[PDB]
Write an enzyme that holds these catalytic residues in place. Structure first.
Site, PDB file in Angstrom:
ATOM      1  N   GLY A 241       0.885  -1.180   0.000  1.00  0.00           N
ATOM      2  CA  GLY A 241       0.000   0.000   0.000  1.00  0.00           C
ATOM      3  C   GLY A 241       0.905   1.206   0.000  1.00  0.00           C
TER       4      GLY A 241
ATOM      5  CD  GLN B 175       3.539   5.775   2.954  1.00  0.00           C
ATOM      6  OE1 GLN B 175       2.581   5.219   2.430  1.00  0.00           O
ATOM      7  NE2 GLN B 175       4.659   5.112   3.303  1.00  0.00           N
TER       8      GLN B 175
ATOM      9  CB  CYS C  92       5.614   1.776   7.359  1.00  0.00           C
ATOM     10  SG  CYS C  92       5.089   3.446   6.764  1.00  0.00           S
ATOM     11  CG  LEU C  93       6.897   1.031   1.294  1.00  0.00           C
ATOM     12  CD1 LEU C  93       6.168   1.370  -0.008  1.00  0.00           C
ATOM     13  CD2 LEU C  93       7.976  -0.025   1.089  1.00  0.00           C
TER      14      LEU C  93
ATOM     15  CG  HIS D  15      -0.485   0.583   7.378  1.00  0.00           C
ATOM     16  ND1 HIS D  15       0.412  -0.057   8.216  1.00  0.00           N
ATOM     17  CD2 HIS D  15       0.242   1.436   6.623  1.00  0.00           C
ATOM     18  CE1 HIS D  15       1.614   0.465   8.036  1.00  0.00           C
ATOM     19  NE2 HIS D  15       1.536   1.362   7.076  1.00  0.00           N
ATOM     20  CD  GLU D  16      -0.918   2.180   2.993  1.00  0.00           C
ATOM     21  OE1 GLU D  16      -0.202   3.195   3.101  1.00  0.00           O
ATOM     22  OE2 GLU D  16      -0.472   1.058   3.214  1.00  0.00           O
TER      23      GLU D  16
ATOM     24  CG  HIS E  72       0.298   6.810   5.747  1.00  0.00           C
ATOM     25  ND1 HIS E  72       1.424   7.041   6.509  1.00  0.00           N
ATOM     26  CD2 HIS E  72       0.417   5.553   5.257  1.00  0.00           C
ATOM     27  CE1 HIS E  72       2.202   5.977   6.475  1.00  0.00           C
ATOM     28  NE2 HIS E  72       1.615   5.068   5.720  1.00  0.00           N
TER      29      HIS E  72
HETATM   30  O1  LIG Z   1       1.884   0.710   3.638  1.00  0.00           O
HETATM   31  C1  LIG Z   1       2.686  -0.212   3.974  1.00  0.00           C
HETATM   32  O2  LIG Z   1       3.929  -0.168   3.749  1.00  0.00           O
HETATM   33  C2  LIG Z   1       2.168  -1.443   4.656  1.00  0.00           C
HETATM   34  C3  LIG Z   1       0.826  -1.620   5.085  1.00  0.00           C
HETATM   35  C4  LIG Z   1       0.924  -2.878   5.642  1.00  0.00           C
HETATM   36  S1  LIG Z   1      -0.120  -3.971   6.367  1.00  0.00           S
HETATM   37  C5  LIG Z   1       1.131  -5.196   6.586  1.00  0.00           C
HETATM   38  C6  LIG Z   1       2.344  -4.715   6.058  1.00  0.00           C
HETATM   39  C7  LIG Z   1       2.144  -3.422   5.553  1.00  0.00           C
HETATM   40  N1  LIG Z   1       2.990  -2.533   4.924  1.00  0.00           N
END
Ligand SMILES: O=C(O)c1cc2sccc2[nH]1
Ligand SMILES: O=C(O)c1cc2sccc2[nH]1
Ligand code: NA
Ligand code: NA
Lengths: 168, 168
Positions: free
Chosen positions: A46, A51, A96-97, A138-139, A142
């Site tokens: 995601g 970001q 997360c990146l 999660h996204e 942000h």
């Molecule tokens: O946005 C991300 O990098 C990310 C969301 C989630 S949910 C599990 C790994 C992960 N990485």
């Protein structure tokens, strides 16, 4: 065009993003395109617009890295809104990146509905569960200035990816 | 001899370390020596024995990196015990050699007493304040299985060192 992913500590990850108001435009299609491609080069599952330092309510996600996980459809979602469909929480590994090398176990809703729009303007409205749901929550964080560390309950599970042997 | 510093996620940072019982020995002097030298090569201001995977109540610290900070005497301390001399907390930037690249603002006691032993066996007992106190509390946390993220109150201040512009 691949964009630089800005890293935790940048104030631009901490903002509350305004809505997208150019649905169906060429400026938005190109930005979405940059996001998929940025996401893809970094091996993301995601990526939220803040970001890449774009202050908008927009995220891309999905894939056929996180090796044990089921397929999630490739999706670009503007103006995401999220409702829990149950109070059931489930713990799972997130990274997360913008926080490279690290991961932690994070509690999320098992079951959600999310709504918003495809870049072309058509409505998107889905029920999601498990990993699919976790990615969207999660996204979504942000877009309101939030990163996963501030959701960690068990700090024994937070650590570098190549070193961690906590068994969930 | 420089030792590898193990990284957050290693279970060996999460243990409660037993006491040193070889004060004045050659095995301890050599281990202390390895710690100063490991600390020195990584540019540390403190290093606890569990960060080089040695399960003992031992830390070294001090220096004449953390550029705005006052001198703290070079110290090797076994069996550290800590008491707050006031309830006053003070926020300050911490990092950690086991969590490379990151830092956060962390509240600590302004004013402490700490006691224990030099490697040679002589007693050490000091009042410390400010940065000196913060260093000792931080290294003491390692001896009870604790890292600084689990003490962060303001997550906006947690981020990579080269990116952070939060103004304390
Ligand atoms: O946005 C991300 O990098 C990310 C969301 C989630 S949910 C599990 C790994 C992960 N990485
Ligand atoms: O042990 C460390 O690496 C450490 C302790 C403290 S206190 C302020 C920075 C810093 N770094
Ligand atoms: Na924030
Ligand atoms: Na622990």
């Amino acid at each position: 065009m691949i964009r630089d992913i800005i890293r935790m500590g940048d104030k631009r990850l901490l903002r509350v993003a305004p809505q997208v108001t150019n649905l169906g435009s060429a400026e938005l299609h190109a930005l979405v395109s940059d996001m998929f491609e940025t996401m893809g080069a970094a091996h993301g599952v995601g990526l939220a617009a803040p970001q890449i330092a774009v202050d908008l309510q927009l995220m891309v996600f999905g894939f056929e890295r996180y090796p044990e996980a089921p397929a999630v459809p490739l999706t670009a979602l503007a103006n995401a809104q999220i409702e829990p469909l149950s109070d059931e929480m489930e713990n799972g590994w997130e990274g997360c990146l913008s926080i490279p090398g690290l991961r932690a176990v994070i509690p999320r809703y098992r079951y959600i509905r999310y709504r918003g729009f495809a870049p072309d303007g058509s409505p998107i409205e889905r029920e999601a569960e498990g990993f699919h749901a976790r990615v969207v929550q999660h996204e979504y964080d942000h877009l309101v200035g939030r990163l996963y560390p501030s959701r960690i309950e068990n700090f024994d599970t937070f650590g570098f990816d190549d070193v961690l042997s906590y068994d969930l």
